[PDB]
Amino acid sequence: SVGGLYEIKIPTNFTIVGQEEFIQTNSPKVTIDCSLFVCSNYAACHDLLSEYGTFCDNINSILDEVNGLLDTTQLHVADTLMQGVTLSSNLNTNLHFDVDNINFKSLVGCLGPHCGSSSRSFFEDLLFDKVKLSDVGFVEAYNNCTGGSEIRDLLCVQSFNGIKVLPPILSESQISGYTTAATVAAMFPPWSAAAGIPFSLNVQYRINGLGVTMDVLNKNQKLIATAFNNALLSIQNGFSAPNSALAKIQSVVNSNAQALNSLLQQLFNKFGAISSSLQEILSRLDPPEAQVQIDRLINGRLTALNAYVSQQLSDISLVKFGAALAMEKVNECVKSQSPRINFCGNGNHILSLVQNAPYGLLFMHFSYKPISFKTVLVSPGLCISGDVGIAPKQGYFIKHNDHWMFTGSSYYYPEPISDKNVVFMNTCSVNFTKAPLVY
Amino acid sequence: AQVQIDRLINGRLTALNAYVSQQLSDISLVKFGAALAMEKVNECVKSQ
Amino acid sequence: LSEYGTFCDNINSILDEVNGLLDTTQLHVADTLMQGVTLSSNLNTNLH
Amino acid sequence: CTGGSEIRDLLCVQSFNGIKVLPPILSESQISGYTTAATVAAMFPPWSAAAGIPFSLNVQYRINGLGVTMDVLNKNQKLIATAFNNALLSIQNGFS
Amino acid sequence: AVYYNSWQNLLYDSNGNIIGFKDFVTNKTYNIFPCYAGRVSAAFHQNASSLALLYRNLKCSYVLNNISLTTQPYFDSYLGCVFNADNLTDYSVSSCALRMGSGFCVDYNSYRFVTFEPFNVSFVNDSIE
Ligand SMILES: *[C@@H]1O[C@H](CO)[C@@H](O[C@@H]2O[C@H](CO)[C@@H](O[C@@H]3O[C@H](CO)[C@@H](O)[C@H](O)[C@@H]3O)[C@H](O)[C@H]2NC(C)=O)[C@H](O)[C@H]1NC(C)=O
Ligand SMILES: *[C@@H]1O[C@H](CO)[C@@H](O[C@@H]2O[C@H](CO)[C@@H](O)[C@H](O)[C@H]2NC(C)=O)[C@H](O)[C@H]1NC(C)=O
Ligand SMILES: *[C@@H]1O[C@H](CO)[C@@H](O[C@@H]2O[C@H](CO)[C@@H](O)[C@H](O)[C@H]2NC(C)=O)[C@H](O)[C@H]1NC(C)=O
Ligand SMILES: *[C@@H]1O[C@H](CO)[C@@H](O)[C@H](O)[C@H]1NC(C)=O
Ligand SMILES: *[C@@H]1O[C@H](CO)[C@@H](O)[C@H](O)[C@H]1NC(C)=O
Ligand SMILES: *[C@@H]1O[C@H](CO)[C@@H](O)[C@H](O)[C@H]1NC(C)=O
Ligand SMILES: *[C@@H]1O[C@H](CO)[C@@H](O)[C@H](O)[C@H]1NC(C)=O
């Protein structure tokens, strides 16, 4: 400190920046037919497998529990998106897509059943087109297995060996309808997702809450709106680059496809038998010795299923943890602005929005970003009049024109000291700057 | 020797699969602990 | 052991995934500590 | 493990049987550098970890927020600082 | 096929399955594909006397021609061929015990195949402007 004052860099200009965050909330519902996987079509194997008793019943029961946990999680996420949402029946997204100079046309799909499954937004369309194996991607791949195609899709070979991915209980088009409705709920009255006020005023009050004077905000409203929709366009364009969110989404599909491929490759291991093929064993040996070989394959394949099941349980614990975080962000970043600093992404978080994504949700976090700075001398408090202390609210005291003035901490704008920007103290602390002439 | 060694191979591979399944379970708790520690850095140390 | 094929490959693949989760977690914790930190270049802890 | 010592460390026997603990991608020295930086970010301007105000004022306002009048806090500032660094010493000694 | 040299007659994949051959007598060349294998997803209600069957990803023409003929009524749903349930996807239910996937549900009075829509928006008729 020089006298009572410290050197601080205060922003003199700013912009809004957008940051993407994919959170996984779901995973491919893998289902295994233990009998078809272990024994294929061979009666001599099904006989021996029946003497192992409940092992296939245990594998099926654990996978049915795991898939029920995924279904319950997907319902709880959809319930969280729809919670409290109230829309006007006059709302028509074919005409109603921008307000207060901010453009939402890309974030909003078809609203209401008259448009059918087209409720996916342009943003969600652009995100889904870069991921082949979404829910509809799996349904189309399995539909092609009886198409007679010369292409040998590993998904068909997996399904014919009893390894298959089922669709989720809610289609991604329904979830995209819920994220569309939750988005338009902030745009128009009654503003049920935006604290009951217009979206631009909510943005303005959130920026003011960072220590920016309202006087710059309500004159720069056009510059703030254009910064906001430029940030949204930068998020959309950012998926064409090697985007970390898109990389995370593809890693969900890739890790699933890798695990299923490893489980299929377990059928070709010999496990110390004369062959990995039941056709070869049963065409080389009679029952007394064929039993000894087939029993080695049954133990190998049942051990591989128990290993895969234990990995699947472990992974779905992480999917439940991720879904609980995504519901917390929908509640405390999108539908409201909880007073938690780095929870809703990094930096000076203004506001957040949500869109559907393959196996999860994609959040857009918008943050106040300083562009340029002024170094200034600031006082954290003043001692004034009859040694009454004052401290600045979300700001600093500064000398301007040899007079004490206040400024917000996030934007340099000298304004007069008043009870609107001050905390009073009946005694001033030590090392508060003496200013007997104030007030 | 093959018949004996194959019992040792099955024993040792079974032990590795058990240790792997325990390690996956433990690391889920380590991730949960790290998520809490980041939340405390943000909401107790850098802010209140 | 080679006639058990992918068993050792599966053990190595799961442990490499686990160790990659730990590494990614340690980076996210360090990022959380460093987030927003601004220091004066005049700062020297031998005197201050 | 290759130092030729007569000591039979279990970590060496584990490593020779293919069981080994690798170092983390960031050393604990780097992490202790990051916790040091995050700590001094509250000591001095711009106070980037202490809400942009001096640490003692942040402590005083936090205590006032509990329902303690500002008058006793800014009068007893020396007693509060002494209680604070005594608490820190009590943690350090409590590790023994 | 053009890849078979004079000493070669069998086409193998990376796993050692045979996937094609050249016939030693006729020199004709064929690809080999596996015969279809799959499950039936049967939906059952305790108050019912029958099952609603879903053949996932199969068209009803394929089920009837290549798997089995049945007397039950059938239709091609999005999920595959559905037997013994009425196609009522225009109808919707807010709760469902027999969840088939992709927002489809089996409901029982016969069985109905209907859409599952567990959540609604609250609507008001107030002006947006
Ligand atoms: C304050 O109230 C006025 C009047 O209700 C609002 O002005 C309207 O704002 C929209 C932008 O959200 C303007 O749309 C623009 O139209 C041109 C074509 O004319 C197009 O090129 C632009 O891309 C944009 O879509 C609209 O013209 C404008 N209407 C009038 C009569 O000015 C204003 O948005 C409200 N809010 C604020 C913060 O001013
Ligand atoms: C099937 O292909 C074989 C191999 O090309 C044919 O056998 C050869 O035919 C030529 C022409 O008559 C002879 O010069 C060769 O000596 C034959 N043997 C071999 C091993 O090359 C055979 O004729 C073909 N048969 C049919 C019905 O197409
Ligand atoms: C199953 O029932 C649905 C609902 O009645 C049928 O879908 C309608 O089909 C007609 C003729 O193509 C269209 O005009 C409607 O727009 C469709 N409605 C919807 C909600 O998509 C469907 O065609 C029936 N399918 C079968 C195989 O019977
Ligand atoms: C703030 O920054 C933008 C982008 O550099 C610029 O267009 C604008 O004129 C600047 N305003 C001020 C007051 O410096
Ligand atoms: C399914 O088959 C049709 C016809 O061959 C083709 O147009 C379509 O692209 C295929 N889709 C997939 C996912 O294989
Ligand atoms: C949802 O809306 C439809 C159409 O108005 C109605 O049939 C159904 O009963 C509603 N369900 C709930 C839970 O509100
Ligand atoms: C809105 O709904 C209520 C209840 O049906 C009705 O009294 C009112 O006239 C309606 N207003 C419009 C504009 O439809």
Side-chain angles (χ1 to χ4, degrees):
Chain A
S1 52
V2 176
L5 299 90
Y6 303 85
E7 289 187 323
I8 296 295
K9 278 192 168 82
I10 300 186
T12 61
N13 198 3
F14 75 93
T15 196
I16 299 187
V17 299
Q19 173 63 54
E20 320 93 306
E21 178 171 44
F22 172 74
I23 307 188
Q24 186 185 359
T25 70
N26 196 15
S27 68
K29 289 177 64 174
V30 185
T31 59
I32 312 295
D33 181 351
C34 176
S35 72
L36 182 65
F37 177 86
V38 177
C39 285
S40 187
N41 202 29
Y42 297 100
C45 183
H46 282 286
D47 293 346
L48 291 168
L49 180 61
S50 76
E51 310 308 344
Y52 265 72
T54 67
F55 254 58
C56 284
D57 303 337
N58 300 120
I59 294 294
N60 293 352
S61 302
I62 288 158
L63 291 177
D64 290 345
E65 173 159 45
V66 165
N67 284 296
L69 260 58
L70 289 178
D71 291 342
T72 304
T73 298
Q74 197 197 25
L75 280 164
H76 196 184
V77 173
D79 188 24
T80 301
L81 287 167
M82 293 289 83
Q83 172 53 38
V85 175
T86 302
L87 302 185
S88 178
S89 65
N90 302 302
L91 184 56
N92 182 358
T93 66
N94 300 285
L95 297 172
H96 310 146
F97 57 85
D98 74 273
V99 67
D100 300 332
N101 313 291
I102 301 177
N103 187 343
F104 305 97
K105 182 65 180 74
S106 60
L107 294 177
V108 174
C110 260
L111 187 71
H114 62 76
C115 192
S117 61
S118 172
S119 295
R120 196 174 326 101
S121 79
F122 179 90
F123 189 112
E124 292 172 14
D125 279 338
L126 181 149
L127 191 63
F128 271 72
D129 286 353
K130 298 186 188 298
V131 179
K132 191 183 184 74
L133 298 181
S134 61
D135 61 339
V136 302
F138 275 116
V139 170
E140 287 186 5
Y142 295 129
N143 284 0
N144 280 4
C145 296
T146 58
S149 180
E150 302 294 325
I151 305 303
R152 296 176 183 270
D153 191 340
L154 287 175
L155 294 180
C156 299
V157 183
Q158 287 167 13
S159 75
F160 295 166
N161 287 281
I163 304 172
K164 194 169 182 167
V165 173
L166 298 189
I169 50 161
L170 303 179
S171 64
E172 292 289 4
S173 178
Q174 289 175 309
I175 309 302
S176 286
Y178 302 152
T179 54
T180 288
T183 301
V184 302
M187 301 319 156
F188 304 108
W191 314 287
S192 74
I197 57 169
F199 185 90
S200 69
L201 294 180
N202 189 252
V203 170
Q204 175 178 315
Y205 299 164
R206 284 294 297 164
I207 297 166
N208 167 245
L210 304 171
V212 183
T213 187
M214 208 78 74
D215 301 0
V216 60
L217 299 185
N218 59 44
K219 74 177 62 184
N220 290 2
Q221 194 284 332
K222 262 284 188 71
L223 294 174
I224 289 160
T226 52
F228 191 95
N229 58 34
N230 284 346
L232 177 60
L233 289 169
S234 83
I235 286 183
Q236 290 177 208
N237 294 348
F239 297 120
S240 69
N243 194 285
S244 63
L246 186 63
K248 197 171 293 181
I249 297 164
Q250 276 281 0
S251 85
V252 178
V253 173
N254 292 345
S255 61
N256 177 71
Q258 161 165 341
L260 299 193
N261 183 56
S262 183
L263 185 59
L264 176 62
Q265 289 300 125
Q266 291 278 14
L267 295 186
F268 304 118
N269 295 326
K270 296 196 297 287
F271 310 100
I274 61 170
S275 177
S276 59
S277 176
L278 293 172
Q279 188 66 27
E280 294 185 352
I281 290 161
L282 291 168
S283 61
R284 283 180 63 169
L285 299 172
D286 265 342
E289 294 293 328
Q291 164 165 0
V292 174
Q293 301 300 315
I294 292 168
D295 190 73
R296 296 183 65 92
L297 296 188
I298 287 171
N299 281 281
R301 293 175 181 185
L302 288 176
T303 305
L305 286 176
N306 276 277
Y308 174 68
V309 176
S310 301
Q311 190 182 358
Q312 193 72 12
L313 270 169
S314 302
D315 292 347
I316 301 299
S317 82
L318 303 182
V319 178
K320 278 178 55 66
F321 175 86
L325 178 60
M327 294 186 292
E328 196 180 324
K329 297 211 189 197
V330 168
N331 289 323
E332 295 194 44
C333 311
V334 184
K335 290 179 182 286
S336 77
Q337 309 305 331
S338 187
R340 300 169 65 191
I341 294 304
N342 293 320
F343 183 64
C344 308
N346 291 327
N348 310 296
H349 171 256
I350 299 167
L351 171 147
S352 186
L353 292 177
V354 68
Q355 290 289 275
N356 194 24
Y359 311 101
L361 295 173
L362 189 146
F363 298 89
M364 292 151 286
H365 303 308
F366 299 95
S367 299
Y368 176 91
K369 177 63 182 291
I371 286 291
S372 67
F373 300 85
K374 185 183 180 71
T375 177
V376 296
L377 288 170
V378 308
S379 196
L382 298 175
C383 191
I384 69 168
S385 73
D387 293 308
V388 176
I390 57 163
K393 291 176 59 67
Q394 292 288 5
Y396 297 109
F397 301 120
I398 53 173
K399 278 293 203 79
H400 192 221
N401 322 297
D402 196 24
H403 183 204
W404 286 108
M405 308 197 68
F406 170 95
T407 184
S409 60
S410 292
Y411 188 90
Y412 179 75
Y413 190 87
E415 63 173 60
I417 299 176
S418 68
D419 62 350
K420 309 301 168 64
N421 55 32
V422 163
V423 178
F424 291 92
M425 309 184 319
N426 295 332
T427 47
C428 76
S429 71
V430 298
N431 297 3
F432 273 22
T433 308
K434 292 297 199 184
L437 307 184
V438 173
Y439 196 78
Chain B
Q2 164 166 1
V3 174
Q4 301 300 318
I5 291 168
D6 194 56
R7 284 214 280 273
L8 296 187
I9 287 171
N10 277 278
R12 293 174 181 186
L13 288 176
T14 300
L16 287 177
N17 278 274
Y19 174 68
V20 163
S21 302
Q22 173 169 13
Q23 194 73 12
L24 273 169
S25 303
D26 292 347
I27 296 282
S28 82
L29 303 180
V30 179
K31 278 178 54 65
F32 176 86
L36 178 60
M38 288 181 293
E39 196 180 322
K40 296 212 188 196
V41 170
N42 290 323
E43 297 195 45
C44 311
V45 183
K46 291 179 182 286
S47 78
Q48 310 305 330
Chain C
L1 177 61
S2 78
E3 313 307 349
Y4 287 79
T6 68
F7 251 122
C8 284
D9 298 345
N10 273 264
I11 296 296
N12 295 348
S13 301
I14 289 158
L15 292 179
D16 290 345
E17 172 159 45
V18 163
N19 287 302
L21 258 58
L22 285 178
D23 290 342
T24 302
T25 299
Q26 195 197 26
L27 280 166
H28 195 185
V29 173
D31 187 26
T32 301
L33 287 168
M34 298 308 293
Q35 183 66 41
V37 175
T38 303
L39 304 183
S40 178
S41 66
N42 302 300
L43 185 57
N44 188 342
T45 68
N46 297 284
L47 293 171
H48 300 284
Chain D
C1 298
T2 60
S5 181
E6 303 295 325
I7 303 302
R8 297 174 183 274
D9 189 340
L10 288 175
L11 294 178
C12 297
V13 181
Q14 287 166 19
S15 76
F16 295 166
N17 287 278
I19 304 174
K20 194 169 181 167
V21 172
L22 297 188
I25 52 162
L26 300 176
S27 63
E28 293 284 11
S29 180
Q30 290 173 307
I31 309 303
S32 63
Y34 301 153
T35 53
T36 288
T39 302
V40 300
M43 289 189 72
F44 300 108
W47 313 287
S48 73
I53 57 170
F55 184 85
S56 68
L57 295 182
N58 192 304
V59 170
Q60 174 179 315
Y61 299 161
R62 284 295 298 163
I63 297 165
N64 167 245
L66 305 171
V68 184
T69 187
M70 206 69 81
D71 197 306
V72 303
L73 300 181
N74 63 47
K75 185 177 180 180
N76 294 345
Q77 193 283 332
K78 276 277 289 186
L79 294 174
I80 289 162
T82 297
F84 191 95
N85 62 41
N86 283 348
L88 177 59
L89 289 169
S90 84
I91 285 178
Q92 291 178 205
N93 295 347
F95 288 129
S96 71
Chain E
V2 302
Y3 31 83
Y4 296 103
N5 297 286
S6 60
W7 71 94
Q8 295 174 305
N9 289 297
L10 302 176
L11 176 70
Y12 279 81
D13 71 11
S14 60
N15 285 316
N17 310 293
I18 292 167
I19 64 163
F21 84 109
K22 188 174 68 167
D23 179 65
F24 289 78
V25 179
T26 63
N27 297 322
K28 297 186 64 176
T29 46
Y30 308 86
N31 283 344
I32 310 187
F33 294 94
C35 296
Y36 177 90
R39 306 178 85 159
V40 184
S41 295
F44 181 58
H45 194 300
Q46 287 159 231
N47 295 0
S49 59
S50 63
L51 302 174
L53 309 178
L54 168 66
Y55 288 79
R56 290 187 182 268
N57 315 105
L58 295 190
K59 293 188 182 293
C60 297
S61 59
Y62 184 94
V63 184
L64 293 167
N65 294 341
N66 310 102
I67 299 168
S68 59
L69 296 172
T70 61
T71 189
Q72 297 162 120
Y74 63 85
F75 75 98
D76 291 296
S77 81
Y78 178 75
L79 300 175
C81 188
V82 174
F83 291 82
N84 194 35
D86 299 322
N87 176 27
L88 292 176
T89 60
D90 168 64
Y91 193 82
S92 200
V93 295
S94 60
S95 67
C96 180
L98 304 170
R99 301 168 194 171
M100 308 305 286
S102 301
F104 298 106
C105 174
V106 168
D107 185 24
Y108 178 74
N109 281 20
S110 66
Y111 294 105
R112 300 173 168 180
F113 188 87
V114 300
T115 51
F116 181 45
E117 293 190 352
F119 308 110
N120 277 343
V121 165
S122 297
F123 284 93
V124 295
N125 65 343
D126 299 312
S127 182
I128 294 281
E129 298 287 7

